[PDB]
Symmetry: C4
Subunit: 240 residues, 4 copies
Amino acid sequence: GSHMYLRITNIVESSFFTKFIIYLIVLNGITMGLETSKTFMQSFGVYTTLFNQIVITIFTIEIILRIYVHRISFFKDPWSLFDFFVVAISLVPTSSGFPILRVLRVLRLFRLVTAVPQMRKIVSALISVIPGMLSVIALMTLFFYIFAIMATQLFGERFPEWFGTLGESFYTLFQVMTLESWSMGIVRPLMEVYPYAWVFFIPFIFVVTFVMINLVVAIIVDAMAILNQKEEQHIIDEVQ
Amino acid sequence: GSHMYLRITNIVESSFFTKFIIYLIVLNGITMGLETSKTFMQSFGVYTTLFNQIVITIFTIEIILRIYVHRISFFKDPWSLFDFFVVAISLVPTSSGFPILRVLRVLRLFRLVTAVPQMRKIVSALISVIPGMLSVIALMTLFFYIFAIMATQLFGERFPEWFGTLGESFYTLFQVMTLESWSMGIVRPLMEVYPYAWVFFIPFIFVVTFVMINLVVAIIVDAMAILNQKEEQHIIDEVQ
Amino acid sequence: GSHMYLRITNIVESSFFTKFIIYLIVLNGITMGLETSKTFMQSFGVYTTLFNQIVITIFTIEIILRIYVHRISFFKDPWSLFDFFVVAISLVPTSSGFPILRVLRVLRLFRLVTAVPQMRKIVSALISVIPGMLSVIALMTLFFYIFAIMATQLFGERFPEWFGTLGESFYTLFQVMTLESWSMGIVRPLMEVYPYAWVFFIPFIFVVTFVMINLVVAIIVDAMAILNQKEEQHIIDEVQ
Amino acid sequence: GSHMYLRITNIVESSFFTKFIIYLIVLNGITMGLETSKTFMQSFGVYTTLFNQIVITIFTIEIILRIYVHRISFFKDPWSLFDFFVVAISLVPTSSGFPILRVLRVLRLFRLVTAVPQMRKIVSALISVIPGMLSVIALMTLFFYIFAIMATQLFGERFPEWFGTLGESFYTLFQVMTLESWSMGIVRPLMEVYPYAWVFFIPFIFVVTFVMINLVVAIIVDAMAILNQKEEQHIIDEVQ
Ligand SMILES: CCCCCCCCCCCCCC(=O)OC[C@H](COP(=O)(O)OCC[N+](C)(C)C)OC(=O)CCCCCCCCCCCCC
Ligand SMILES: CCCCCCCCCCCCCC(=O)OC[C@H](COP(=O)(O)OCC[N+](C)(C)C)OC(=O)CCCCCCCCCCCCC
Ligand SMILES: CCCCCCCCCCCCCC(=O)OC[C@H](COP(=O)(O)OCC[N+](C)(C)C)OC(=O)CCCCCCCCCCCCC
Ligand SMILES: CCCCCCCCCCCCCC(=O)OC[C@H](COP(=O)(O)OCC[N+](C)(C)C)OC(=O)CCCCCCCCCCCCC
């Protein structure tokens, strides 16, 4: 709370500021989708690479300004910590070799979430249910890891593409979970060498599906014992 | 409100009128399904092409009559705006070349919805939930568009059939969303050139599915906080 | 209500009677599953064909007895009308040529439903929800029939195996509904001749899925406005 | 209740005891996942086979101790009966030939459930709903067994890989239930010999899916007539 600090704060917390940031994001969005076309990039190539690092600096300025305003509440606000990390990624130069970092630039279009509250509310409601599932996710991951071990010991010999490695089984088992060609592509070929592989996979499909179903039925039915107690006491409220 | 206007209005708003329109629709339905057979079309070919443009004019007459009756309320009633556009399509002649317009004729069997209230009510209940999802659809589309860009930059070089174009990635990613041969057909071939493509697609499958599930759980659980407040206040109603 | 009529009725409505019928059904079940094996059928072949027509006559006797008891209430009780038709099928001899009728014999194992009330209750609860869906099924079938026509006109020329016939499109479209290899197997081959077939199928997948989801959300949420009014009035019951 | 019995009981029922057991389980978990790598097993091979039978004896000791404490309540506590059977499996030596028993060792990582109450509660909630489904599972299994018989009689001749055996049809039908390449892989090849096989499988897909959906809708809606009566009477509670 000072002279220039508060002058800054009026700009950062302003309508024009976020409007402009969003306005820029949508442009850099169309910019980055047009960068897809070599027809475009052959012609108007530099027009966009410049436009990008114009926007990167603006976003860096904007992040710096928001830090001076928000102090510690910036590095505990997830939506800002995202904007920090998602813009810092775009500041690591292409001079560092690793080819994907020039592609991680595009994640800065996710600012359209953190800077638009309609999206922020949806995103929050989806993350809101994850912590209740963290213990069901835990059992599933242990389930996968136990069956990843067994499959790597049972099938990775005669089938190394699918099971020769704990990870290759993890991927394959996750594909069995999606039911993606689990039978025609995996178990039926496995069965023409190991006749009983169906004893492994048919129960695995049963458990990992039946659990996924109860994960949802838990979410719904347990969400609505609350609406049936928040109502109950507010009906017991008005009966004395 | 006049002499002939009101004479017309009794016909348009009548039971016989809609009954006849529906009666015609069902016939032109069987007409258009029999037009499938060359055995039929070789024999009774003209019997149907005539029958069609008999029905088209009747439907044009009927649309004209309904406009004189309903005035502005016809061009704000969606069910009529449909009948308008769906019959106007059938009036663009096959003399205009574009081959599909002779196939868009069949959409005039969707009149059986707009002209039968039992269907109109179902259709209304399905469209009724879309506006609540428009913001979740928005995030998904941005999600797709961000990952469509990245995939087109990561894989369209060595895999142009699947990712060489922002649209080809959009289609492919939508196929990954359906889980349609996402692993055997796409990611496993991708991995034999790009070993880490699973880091791209396994999370994409996670997010785009987990969101689709919460879209439904939102629809159900939020629909029924209303039945638990419309009930609550009607229980608080009768306790004073 | 007589002398022999009532003597009969004590047997038909008895515990031993249904117990024996069920006891027989389970045996003819194992009989018919062992008829699968040629190893068995080569050895104990006649032991079962006899056993079957022993049970068929018993079931015919039992149906005749139940008709004399139940009079008109037998030909309006669905569970009996089933037992009637499902045993009458087993009485059409193999002397009539049509090869499948000797296989329709097996449907007489569905008696284990109609004769065991625990199953009858489940079956009733599943059929119970069908009549509410009959109008949503109606729209879907019209939707399929409209898009079956269009696809047969758009693709059956260059793709007769999938679309050359209104039925072949019906089957294919139902396979697109199941998402069974809809892209790799169907639309992607279609697109290498008709580049815009994705404009046909991607919306078709959208509608026919989005409707299937709302069919369930309708079932759940509407079932439980009843439990929230049967409760409400029974709470308004006790507040005067 | 004695001198040494109660000395033992303080150790078994202690925090350190279960903490140590869990601490060991997590190590033997990483041990067994590293046993996947031949690079590891070539080098530090004996380091783990020893470590395993160190843990097996500790778990045997621990099971023996828990039996002396818990007496009959150990052989009626499912979580212990599991630990008993899951460790007894690891005590059958590899000297008995059957190759899989050395792989069933890994199931002793499921102790991390029975020994961690956060997991035990989830597991209990998932098993909790199974007994309500036991009668719906029963009908499905009879449904499968009836259609497994018919398919083995209809298709196992010209298609022995898929239907030549009651079990091969069971597996195939379960794959049709998963919708795993049911059309492209199974029914479409069947139809190019048996043109009407779609009359078999399209209804089978209908029934076995429609039932699976009602299984869930039953679980949800019936779970919440209870929350709407446990609430109702607790609202009728406070209105006298
Ligand atoms: C209701 C619950 C729903 C979620 C259930 C989750 C079950 C467990 C995760 C399964 C996901 C499958 C992951 C997967 O693709 O595994 C591959 C990796 C890497 O192995 P790698 O050998 O590098 O890749 C094989 C392919 N290759 C050779 C061409 C590179 O394999 C590994 O390295 C092991 C992966 C273990 C993942 C554990 C992550 C932390 C806990 C789970 C968090 C999940 C997201 C919320
Ligand atoms: C819970 C949410 C569920 C819905 C999630 C929706 C996610 C976003 C839409 C994904 C649907 C996939 C669309 C698709 O097939 O994309 C293809 C098009 C055209 O690209 P194009 O390169 O012409 O086609 C490739 C194939 N080829 C070369 C043989 C012609 O690609 C494009 O041109 C871009 C398509 C962008 C669609 C944006 C439409 C407006 C917003 C989304 C509305 C969705 C329906 C309610
Ligand atoms: C939420 C709703 C879920 C249910 C949505 C149902 C949508 C409509 C039914 C779709 C089911 C697909 C039926 C199907 O496989 O169609 C094939 C038939 C026969 O055509 P056909 O050309 O004989 O068979 C082609 C294959 N071939 C040449 C090797 C014999 O094609 C036909 O002949 C036309 C079939 C029209 C079926 C209309 C049946 C009455 C109304 C729907 C009742 C559905 C069950 C409750
Ligand atoms: C809403 C309900 C959801 C659950 C629905 C369950 C429907 C019935 C079970 C279907 C599961 C499919 C089982 C399966 O893979 O069957 C194969 C077995 C063994 O036949 P087999 O000929 O040995 O294996 C064929 C493959 N080969 C030649 C390479 C070895 O086939 C048999 O031997 C017969 C299997 C009968 C299983 C009956 C088990 C007891 C009742 C069901 C319990 C299910 C788990 C809770």
